[PDB]
């Protein structure tokens, strides 16, 4: 697939170039308006590695390098995950081959919005020491191969890179991914057996994160919820995840009826209210937090 | 200097890309019409490593890779010589920092001529197993930084990368480099004390090489002659050179009045007769070989 080739090639180039750039003492205003573009033309050469004619553009390379650091991600590890082997498609989005990252096609509009929030996003991240349920935006690029132009973004996978998820929801509190929905969560009677301390830590993150979203007039986000079943996985020792990698995982409590491990975080935030030119951002967050607070009562 | 930066950067990229390309069982006709171009644009990014906006084009990358191999040169070694440290200028041409290679600015006309002869050049090289006094053309590029476009070519240094040359001539047999000339060779009474076997091997190379030149209607070439003085170098053990690296070196004979080592080869061949739109190529070679055969009598 020529678009994955260019992505793998562009990321590889992106990180290697960056390896020559000094880690700054701080980001500057201009860092949030910067880009690197590269255009390759091979005439009668290299027909076999990948396409002869392509472009690759990286937005705000210093910023996303900074964010990778703040999210506990090493540039060389990142490069490896995206280049050692091709991303795996999903009937859409890809997964890095080691399942650490999601690669997702987005619109120019989405790209523009990511730009409009990137300063506030950064600041929010600093302020919370990288501990948040918001998407972790790791890099953002434009590809051209042939007359096909596309925008992609890379986020941390909400789910474990190792523990399998036998059941998944996407919750809004009121096209779309292969998940179960609000109504299904309700009808199924789905419970999440985590302790009071873990509910408290989780919700107090959610409340701040969501408030940030409302302030930005963003909407239509949801809480992605994945359940690993441990006794099923019998058919790091069993039930274990590295928290430093599987950053959204929370163990069930001692009295959970089933040995579960849960992966919950916010996804798909880049819809601005005005872009819908219904529900305002305030009403959306209010419904959203009420539903989440509810299903975790 | 932004033009050396782009060159170092372009070569580095050139060889690394090539490291992914399979060594072919043979060159194809299209290999001699091929190129790779790359254009970089950095807005508000990477201001410190090198220029923000540049282009780099490599001509016939498969061909010059082949020639590097046939001349006993490993691609990674080549890359290192040109990138580990900046080329050193000459008041003009540069030297690779380890003195193995010459980098030389040339005209588009020269570039066009290199192209016109590149097939015959290749064939000639094969036929003689790489043993020749002709320039060893190792790579050829176009650089653009700012609105400054330039063409460069890389050849093997005629002189030792290690033994110093205290005296240099550029001989034609009838602007210009820092060398002594025909008349000076004559007035000085300059002798070259090599044995009959070495004269014979050298001249029989020269005769074939020069004949090749005449066949191509090339002109205005010369024999670059450099003398290392061994007793002076007292003010690999003394007098030694690796022939595999210092490919043009010939030891003086047992009865030379002074312990010398000599570096002789042909340079500066890319002038085609027609380009001068005097002396024809035949007369030029005839004068040239007669003078060389003469100074080695
Ligand atoms: C087998 O099913 C799954 C496997 C894995 C996942 N995990 C994800 N972790 C984080 N972001 C994600 C995903 C999926 C998509 N996105 C994502 C990214 C970025 C944008 C901009 C948008 C809109 C979505 C979700 C599912 Cl369903
Ligand atoms: C200190 O002085 C020197 C040190 C070193 C050298 N050695 C060289 N070995 C091979 N080609 C060379 C040179 C110099 C130039 N060129 C060269 C290359 C390519 C083109 C196209 C043209 C015209 C010349 C010569 C001198 Cl004088």
Author numbering:
A (entry chain A), B (entry chain A): 35 to 125, 133 to 215, 228 to 288, 327 to 368, 387 to 406
Cite, word for word, the article reporting this structure.
Mammals express three isoforms (α, β and γ) of phosphatidylinositol 5-phosphate 4-kinases (PI5P4Ks), the enzymes that generate phosphatidylinositol bisphosphate (PIP2) from phosphatidylinositol phosphate (PIP), principally via the conversion of PI(5)P to PI(4,5)P2. More specifically, selective inhibition of PI5P4Kα may also have positive therapeutic effects, as demonstrated by the genetic depletion of PI5P4Kα in p53 null THP-1 cells which resulted in the inhibition of proliferation and also prevented AML development in xenografts. The series was optimised to deliver ARUK2002821 (36), a potent PI5P4Kα inhibitor (pIC50 = 8.0) which is selective vs. other PI5P4K isoforms and has broad selectivity against lipid and protein kinases.
In order to solve a structure of a co-complex of PI5P4Kα with a ligand from this series, a truncated version of human PI5P4Kα was cloned into a bacterial expression vector. There is one PI5P4Kα chain in the asymmetric unit. Overall, the protein structure with 36 bound shows a high degree of similarity with that of the apo structure. However, the Lys228–Thr232 loop segment has a different orientation in the 36 complex, resulting in Leu230 becoming part of the binding pocket. 36 binds deeply in the hydrophobic cleft that forms the ATP binding site in lipid kinases. In particular, the compound binds in the largely hydrophobic pocket formed by Phe134, Ile143, Phe200, Leu230, Leu277 and Ile358. The NH linker in 36 forms a hydrogen bond with the side-chain oxygen acceptor of Asn198, while N1 (see heterocycle numbering in Table 3) of compound 36's pyrrolopyrimidine forms a hydrogen bond with the main-chain nitrogen of Val199. Furthermore, N3 of the pyrrolopyrimidine is seen to make a hydrogen bond interaction with an ordered water in the binding site. This water is positioned by further hydrogen bonding to the side-chain oxygen acceptor of Thr196. The side-chains of Phe134, Asn124, Lys145 and Lys209 have been re-orientated compared with the apo structure. These side-chain re-orientations result in a tight fit of the aniline aromatic ring, with the chlorine contacting the lipophilic part of the Lys209 and Thr232 side chains, as well as Leu230 and Leu277.
